[PDB]
Every structure is written in structure tokens, then in C-alpha cells.
Ligand binder design. Structure first.
Ligand code: HEM
Ligand code: HEM
Ligand SMILES: [Fe+2]
Ligand SMILES: [Fe+2]
Ligand SMILES: [Fe+2]
Ligand SMILES: [Fe+2]
Ligand SMILES: [Fe+2]
Ligand SMILES: [Fe+2]
Ligand SMILES: [Fe+2]
Ligand SMILES: [Fe+3]
Ligand SMILES: [Fe+3]
Ligand SMILES: [Fe+3]
Ligand SMILES: [Fe+3]
Ligand SMILES: [Fe+3]
Ligand SMILES: [Fe+3]
Lengths: 158, 158, 158, 158, 157, 157, 157
């Protein structure tokens, strides 16, 4: 089996995006933990682990088609200072990923490669779920305010 | 609910292929067991059982569309003498099945029958996995050699 | 050890008969299940599994004598629409098998090969039991009738 | 009940063969153990115990017919130095036993003594199984070679 | 499937013999129990139950061949007063059964009916075992004597 | 390490004696079982198994010294009809074994081979125990008589 | 109780040999472990522990006789680089120990001191077992070869 170079190009681009997202999410979780926002940090850490799982699946698919995974290239990592900025950066990443996923799914399904299309379909569903969560949190912050919102995620906790 | 004749023709052809594969894999497993190659025999027996399950699923799908399953056909069965020959025969069977599966999925999805397309998609994923395994084993035999490779799959008994 | 070609011919013929019976019984069980006759379907499925066991024993015996098992040849498979027709087809298959078994047992025991004769003896006992069951069911259907008999093997759900 | 002298002669000859086989197998197992070949030694010890059981059954049958079991005879015992020689000696013993068993079964069944014939039939089946094992091991040694074959049965522990 | 009338005749004869043996063994066990010979009665009861099982197997085989089992005919039942006499009667029954079994096995196997031959083979093995036991007990009684032998099978309860 | 040929000769002679004893004891146990003497048969089986254990130890010792064990020759096997005769045959075997063991122990210990001497010492102790048992049983049979003695080792089961 | 000077001299010499063997075996086990040969290392470590136990027993016996154990001596320690060399060094040590043990046992038993003789007898049996193992391993290496033999004792974990 030897896949088309275009399919492998799409998969490698998605892999680079996954690695960038992993780095950004872990850094954000550590930064949030340093400030005393424990409950946010737990959620962000879980999201980073999910990003790893996506990256592993993509790597396995690329290896099965007799390609060379790219572990050297990275995109630009966004770091925010307040919580609104972190949420906005995550939203940007998710939107880019969703657009790429849709275009790649169409292209792959046009050339009789169904398994890669199914992989991108699952990843797309997960990305949509995460973006919905991010938008809900941004709305909550907009309504309550930053201080009253942050008052609900701090624990003395030994 | 009455399916198109072409969809039923595709499904019956896949069923005939499944039955042929079941027979060939079971015979190969028995032959390997008779020679003292135990782990290979176990793996081949498991593969034959998986083929049996695939045949059952195909039969159910054909019956739901008010068709007549064909249990009288059979394609040519290939029997080898050394390990390399068995692996090569299995590879040939898998390649034929994968080509047929892709063409059938396209045709079925062009006529608004989605469930049959999903069935073929799952079968295609399984076939790709098995072909990958076969190619890996052929590479290992090429590198190590037949005697040193066979020395790793022989056991005494109790 | 190298058995006589006639003994191997007998064993291979019995193996072909076993494979044909396996296919016919499985197809009949699936057809019965599709109509709602669950209790008949369970029994037919069990019979198909027993036919597998017989085929495996025959294959092992053939391999021990340094022969080539035949997995390419099939006889004619009979399919019926009613239940009486299915029972009649099964009866025909059983009668043929019993006749072949008796002749083969005599021939094998005339040439000092006892293990093969014992194998055929066990298979013959099993076939006689199954034919007795089939005749009893046909008598019950004759006495009661199709509708009243079928009313006793239909179950709503689980 | 008093059996025919010829039946008792056959049974006593088989008993002498059993005793000789027991002695040879135990000596071979001890010799293999002294050299560091552990799994071979275990298998040979199990075979010796099986021959012990066969001798016991033969003794019981002889006693039930009001005869005198012979515990003073012994055939020539063969001892090898390499693995091939041991396997060849075992093969010779098995071939002799099988020939005697077939002739004895025919003679016994010609004179209306059925239980003795059944005893010989069971012993014959066991002997055929063992000879098949021996031939398989000889083929494996021929294919791999003595050094690579022996590398798979050595283990130093406690 | 319809068997030959001769095979069915053999099987029905062997069934009549089994019924006679069942009756004789149960009566002997009850008689032994009445006298206080506690340990003999258990063995005799077990033998009677084994005969019952043999009769059931024979009945099943006869029914499978589309025949009519005979439950009306009996042979002569022998009753002994001493223990030696009981053992001797049992020995006679066993010898008759063994002879009939061998002849029937030969005839059945000459006509391509193998399952019936196997049934008779199993029954023959069992009969040989029982006759061996009976002969051993007769030898023990001969060596020891009635009183010393009987002193070993009585119990207070 | 290579032992002296004389030590190996002694060990091989003891091995031949062990094999002969194994055969004789097993045959006697089977014969006793066929007659209905269950409790004697159990003891005889146990003795035969002990004789095998002795044979295995001797074989291991011979192999460690780079010798060739002899599994081809046997002595004369004694078979008796009564129980007194069986006991007498066993006594003869034991006496021969004990004499050989003492002479071999002295010779082995005279040449600086201690492990073989210890092996023979253990075997000698076991043989003395068995001979004591045999003599006790012969005395009991002499005092009671054969019938009254045999009446104590029979069961129905 | 005061033992003879010669008995104590023999015991102290055996103690020095034991200490030397302990050091050599532990060093060999560590060296084998550093190279990736795991099962050999385990076996050698067990052997070193056994030597430790032997040294303890010898020390106890020497103290019971009102003597002074020597913990300052040491014989030459042999270190190899390949497996064959290690096995050969161990064989040399074992042969020396066995010769000394036999001579000491004779001398001790000539002067009516039996417990020390029994101690040396047990140690001698153990030494013979170990030397047999070493010779078997050397034969296996000779037959298979160095690489194919080492391929069976390497584990990755
Ligand atoms: C066209 C021929 C055959 C068909 C359509 C067929 C079909 C099936 C199916 C669908 C099952 C379901 C088992 C499950 O649900 O786990 C089954 C059971 C089984 N069949 Fe077959 N089979 C065929 C030939 C054979 C042959 C030739 C053998 C033996 C040489 C065999 C051995 C078995 C075994 C062992 C099982 C049960 C596995 C287990 O319980 O571990 N089959 N069969
Ligand atoms: C070193 C040689 C032998 C070994 C290791 C050995 C080992 C054994 C063992 C462990 C048992 C079962 C123990 C028990 O259940 O009491 C047994 C049973 C038996 N052995 Fe041996 N034995 C040896 C020698 C022999 C010889 C030389 C013969 C015949 C000449 C023999 C004939 C038998 C028989 C017939 C049985 C069945 C015992 C029974 O069912 O009562 N054995 N053997
Ligand atoms: Fe992702
Ligand atoms: Fe398949
Ligand atoms: Fe069948
Ligand atoms: Fe045997
Ligand atoms: Fe009966
Ligand atoms: Fe002994
Ligand atoms: Fe030591
Ligand atoms: Fe496949
Ligand atoms: Fe059937
Ligand atoms: Fe054998
Ligand atoms: Fe009876
Ligand atoms: Fe003894
Ligand atoms: Fe040591």
C-alpha cells in the first residue's frame, strides 16, 4: 500500500497542528495552576491528554501508508495573560483545525481512501465539542464578570 | 425494502470471497500445526474465526434486503508448502478483497444505500490491518532467514 | 506411515460431505431465524457446529496418514422454503452419509486400518441419532399441522 | 474362563515389549537431563510413565484370563549419544510394536475374544500418536540443525 | 431405518435375560439383608441397579430400530438358601449371558450393524468383570469356611 | 571426576538388584490384589515405589561419576503361590541386598569416596527396616494360622 | 573440650578458601550483570550466598572447639573476561577445595573427631554438585558456541 502524496501532506499538516495544540494546552494548564485556579487547570490538562491521543492516532495512520511522520515542524504558540485571552487563543486554534479537517475530508473521500476520511471525521467531532465548551465559558465570563467568575474555581485544598 | 440487483451482486461476490478465505486459512492453520509451528497456527486459527464472523455479517445484510445468499460458489484455494508461500497467498487474497471492497463502496454510496457502504467500510479496515501484518512478517523472514525465524515459534508440549 | 489410496479416497469423500452439510445447516438456521422461529434456529446452529467438529476430526486423521485434504470440492446444497422441505433435505443428506459410512467402515476394516474404522463408527452413531430426531419432528408436523406446530417455536423478544 | 494359549502368547509378548520400552525411555530421559536438555527430559519422562500404565493394563488383562504374566524377559535396549540417535531408536521400537499390535488384533478378533482386541486397539492408537511426534521432531532437527535446535531446550535455573 | 428381524430377536432375548437378572439380584439382596449380612446386601443392590441400566440401554436401542420391546417374558429365577448357592446361581446366569453375547456380536457384525455390536461389547465386558468377582468370592469361601467368612460381613446396627 | 571401576561395578550390581526387586514386588502386589487381599496389596505397592526411588538415586550417582548405567540385565525373579512363600522370597532378596551393601560400603570408604558410602548407608537402613517388617509378619502367620490371618485383610467395597 | 591443633589448622584453611570463593563469586556475578547477562548473574549470586553459609558453619565449628578463627588471610582471586574463563576459574577453585576436603576428612576421622568429619562430608557433597554444573555449562558452550549460547541469557526489561 502506498497512499497519494496529497493525502500524506494533509495528514502531516494535521499532525503538526496537533503537536502545536498539545504544547499550548500544557503551558496554559501550568500557568493557570501557578495562579491558584485549580479546577480550570484540571480541565486544561485533560484536554492536552486528548490532543496527545489524536496525535498518536494520526501517527499510526501515517505509518501504515508507508510515509514519514514529521516531528520537527511547529506552528506559532499563543500565550495569554488573563483567562479571556487563553479562551480566545484556544478558539482560534479550534477554528483553524476545523476548516482544515473539512477540506481534507472532502479531498480524501474524492480519491477512494475511506479510512483516513473516517479518522478526520472523528477528530472533527471532537474539535466541535471543544469549541462549543470554549464559547460557553466565554459567555459565562461575559455575563458574570472576571472576579465573580474566578471566585468559583479557587480552592485552599491543603 | 428491496435492494438493487447490483448491490446484491456485490454483496454475494464478497460473501463468496469470505467463504474461500475461511477455507484457505483453516487449512493453512492445520498444516502449520502438523509441522510443529504452534504460535503461527494459533494466529491463523484466530484469523479464520474473524473471517467466519465477516461471512455471518454479510449473510445477515443480504437477508435483510430480501435476497438469496449463495452458499454454493467457491474461488480457487491456494495452498503453500513453506511459510513464504503461505504469506504470499494470503497477501494475494487480501489485495483482491480490498480492490473489490473499494469499488463496491463507491457504487453502493452512489445509489443512496448507506448501511451496506458502512459494512464494506468496516470490512475494508480489517483487511488493511491483516495485509499490514502479513507484509511485516514477510519482511522479518527476509531479514532473519527461514531457519532462524522458525526457531522462534516452536515449543514442546505437556 | 502411508495409508492406502483407497482409505484416503474414502476419508476425503466423507470430508466433502461434511463441508456440504455444514454449509446447508448454517444457511437453514439463518433462514429460520429470519422468519421468527428462534427455537428451531438454535437447534440447527448447534447441529452445524457438530458438523464442524466432525470435519476437523476427519482432517486431522487425513493429515496423520501423509495425505492432502481437499477443501475445494462441494456437493449440491439443498434449500427449502417450508419447514417440511428443510427436514426432508436433511434426511436425504443423512441417509447418503450413513450408506457411505457403512461401506467405508467395511472396506477399511478389511485392510488392517482400525483407527479410521473407529472414527467412521463414531460418526455413524452421531448420524443415526440426528436422523432419528429428524424423523420424529416430521411425524410431529404430520400429526399436528404447520400452523399449530409453528405456534410452539415463536417467541416475542428478550 | 480360560483363554486360548495363542492369545496369552500375544499378550505376554506385548508385555515384554512394554517393559523394554519403559527401561529405554527412562534411561534416555536421565541421560538427556544430565546434559542440560530440560524440556526434552520432561517429555521423555512423561512417555515412560505412559508406558508404565500400558504395562499395568496388559498385566490386569492377562491375570483375568488365568495366565502367568512374564516379568523375566527383556528385549535388546538401544542407547544413543546424540538426539537424532535417540529419536531413531524410539522410532524403531514404535514400528515393531505397531506391526505386532495389528497382527495380534486380527488373530484375537478371529477367535471371538473382543476385549483383548479392544485393548490392543487403544494401545495401537497411542503408539501411532507417539510415532507421529517422533517423526515431526526428526524433521525439525533436519531443517534447523542440531545446535540451533538444542538452543531452544536449554535453561539454567535454581 | 428398519433393522433385520434377527438382530431384533437377539436384542429382545438379551433384554429378557436382563430383566430376569434384575429380579434375581434384588431378591437375593433382600434375603441377605434379612439375615444380618449387612455388607453383602449393598454390593448386591449395586449389581441390580447396573442390570437396570443395561436393560434401559437395550430398550433404547430396540426402540431406535422401530421394534417392539418385550416386557412380558421371563426366564427361570434361581433362589439359594446358603451364600455358596447364591454365588453359584449368579455364576450360571453370567455364563449364559456371556455365551449369548458373543454369538450375537458375531452375527450382528456380519450384517453391517455396528452400533448394536458395540452395545453388546460393552455389556460383555461388564459381565466378565462380574463373573470374575463371583469366582473370587467362591474361592475365598472355599479357603476360609462359612462361619469365618460370614463373621467379616456382619455389623451391629 | 572419574570414579574407580570397582566402585562403579558395585553401584551397577546394586542397580541390577534394585530393578529385580521392583519387578518382583509389583508382580506380587498384583497377584495379591487378584485374590482379594487388598490391605496386603497396598503395602506391596508402597514397597515397589520405594524400590524405584532407590533405583533413581543409584542412577543419578552413577551418572555423576561419568559411567554407563546398566538397564539390560536382571537376576532371577521369585514368585510364590501362598503368602508365606512370598514373604520368604522377599526375605531372601533383602538378605542378599544387605550383605552386598555392607561389603560395598567398606570397599568404597577404603578409597576416599564418601558420598557413595553414604548412599549405601541410607539404602542399608531402609533394607533393614523392611526385613524387620517381613519377619514380624512371618511370626504373626506362624502364631495365628493362614485362615485366621487372611480373614483380617479382606474387604467387600 | 579442646581440639587437636591439626584439626583446627584444617578448618582454618577451609575457612580461608571459603572467603576467597565468596569474593570471587560475588565479583563475577557483578561483572556478568554489568554486561547484560541476567540469568547467569542470578545463578552466580545464589552460589555466593551458599558459600557465605558454608563460611558461617565453619566459623561456628571452630568457635565450639575453643579456637581463633582467621579472618585476615586470602588466597589469590581469579578474574576472567569471557564466560569460558570464569567457568574455568571456578572449576579450578572447586578442584582444590575437593582435594583438601578429602584429605581433611581422612585425617579428622583418624583421631576420633566425628562432627568435623561430617561437616566436611556435607561441604564435599555440595562442592561436587557445583563442579558438575560447571562442567555441564562448559560442554554446552563448547557445543553451541559463544554467541548462540549468550543469546539465551540476555533479557531486556
Ligand atoms: C463455509 C464454511 C464455514 C462457515 C460459513 C462457517 C461459519 C461459522 C460461524 C459464523 C461461526 C460463528 C462462531 C462464533 O460466533 O464464535 C462458526 C463457528 C465455528 N466454526 Fe465455522 N464455518 C465454516 C467452516 C468451518 C470449518 C471448515 C471449520 C474447522 C476446520 C470450522 C470451525 C468452527 C469453529 C471451531 C467454530 C467455533 C469457534 C469457537 O467456538 O472457538 N468452521 N462457523
Ligand atoms: C526409575 C524407574 C521408575 C520410576 C521413576 C517409576 C515411577 C513411577 C511412579 C511415580 C508411579 C506412580 C506412583 C504411585 O502412584 O504409587 C509408577 C507406577 C507404576 N510403575 Fe513405575 N517407576 C519406575 C520403575 C518401574 C518399572 C521398572 C516398571 C516395570 C518393570 C514399572 C511399572 C509401573 C506400573 C505398572 C505402575 C502402575 C502402578 C499402579 O497403577 O498401581 N515402574 N511408577
Ligand atoms: Fe486534536
Ligand atoms: Fe474477510
Ligand atoms: Fe457429520
Ligand atoms: Fe506402550
Ligand atoms: Fe446385564
Ligand atoms: Fe532397595
Ligand atoms: Fe564452599
Ligand atoms: Fe482479511
Ligand atoms: Fe449429522
Ligand atoms: Fe509407545
Ligand atoms: Fe451380570
Ligand atoms: Fe527393601
Ligand atoms: Fe562451591
Amino acid at each position: 500500500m502506498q497512499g497519494d502524496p496529497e493525502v500524506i501532506e494533509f495528514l502531516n499538516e494535521q499532525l503538526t497542528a496537533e503537536l502545536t495544540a498539545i504544547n499550548q494546552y500544557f503551558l496554559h494548564a501550568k500557568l493557570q495552576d501557578h495562579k491558584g485556579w485549580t479546577k480550570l487547570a484540571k480541565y486544561t490538562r485533560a484536554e492536552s491528554f486528548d490532543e496527545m491521543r489524536h496525535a498518536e492516532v494520526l501517527t499510526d495512520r501515517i505509518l501504515l501508508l508507508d510515509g514519514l511522520p514529521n516531528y520537527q515542524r511547529l506552528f506559532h504558540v499563543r500565550v495569554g495573560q488573563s483567562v479571556t485571552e487563553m479562551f480566545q487563543a484556544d478558539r482560534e486554534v479550534e477554528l483553524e483545525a476545523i476548516d482544515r479537517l473539512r477540506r481534507g475530508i472532502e479531498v480524501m473521500r474524492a480519491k477512494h481512501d475511506i479510512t483516513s476520511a473516517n479518522v478526520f471525521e472523528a477528530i472533527l467531532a471532537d474539535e466541535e465539542h471543544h469549541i462549543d465548551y470554549l464559547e460557553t465559558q466565554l459567555d459565562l465570563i461575559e455575563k458574570l464578570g472576571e472576579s465573580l467568575y474566578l471566585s468559583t474555581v479557587i480552592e485552599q485544598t491543603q
